[PDB]
Design a protein around this ligand. Structure first.
Ligand SMILES: CCCCC/C=C\C/C=C\CCCCCCCC(=O)O
Length: 137
């Protein structure tokens, strides 16, 4: 994915498209009552990366979560759905890669810039979710 800077990902983004998010949440083990609220939301995403210090805010009018970390160093993340995972974030090959592990399970969220839009790609097992954000200018 070329030689992009992580700075190109920085800033405030807004969801404009989502496909397969409900299927992905299912694979995580999220309850219907929760999946309904999750898929219904039009969240913002605020990404800030100072050198290797990464912070991602996931914000909706009802619920807001965030994580902060150092690229390359594992940390305990509390996800929005309530999972406690061992997560490492890396900016590899021009893409922000968030790898999660918990209870013997695995999931990877990959964020890249493409055609000016933030392309978020969530993967667990055979399930792939693709969510598109655009810059809030
Ligand atoms: C009342 C609203 C409550 C909504 C929150 C509840 C459920 C959240 C659902 C599961 C979170 C899955 C984490 C993956 C997020 C990546 C999506 C993205 O980065 O684009």
């Amino acid at each position: 994915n070329a030689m992009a800077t992580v700075q190109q990902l920085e800033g405030r983004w807004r969801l404009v498209d989502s496909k397969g998010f409900d299927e992905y949440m299912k694979e995580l083990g999220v309850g219907i009552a929760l999946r309904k609220m999750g898929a219904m939301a039009k969240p913002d995403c605020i990404i800030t990366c100072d050198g290797k210090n990464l912070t991602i805010k996931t914000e909706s009018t009802l619920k807001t979560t965030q994580f902060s970390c150092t690229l390359g160093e594992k940390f305990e993340e509390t996800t929005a759905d309530g999972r406690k995972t061992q997560t490492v974030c890396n900016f590899t090959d021009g893409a922000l890669v968030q790898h999660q592990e918990w209870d013997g399970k695995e999931s990877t969220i990959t964020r890249k810039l493409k055609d000016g839009k933030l392309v978020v790609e969530c993967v667990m097992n055979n399930v792939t979710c693709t969510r598109i954000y655009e810059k809030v200018e």
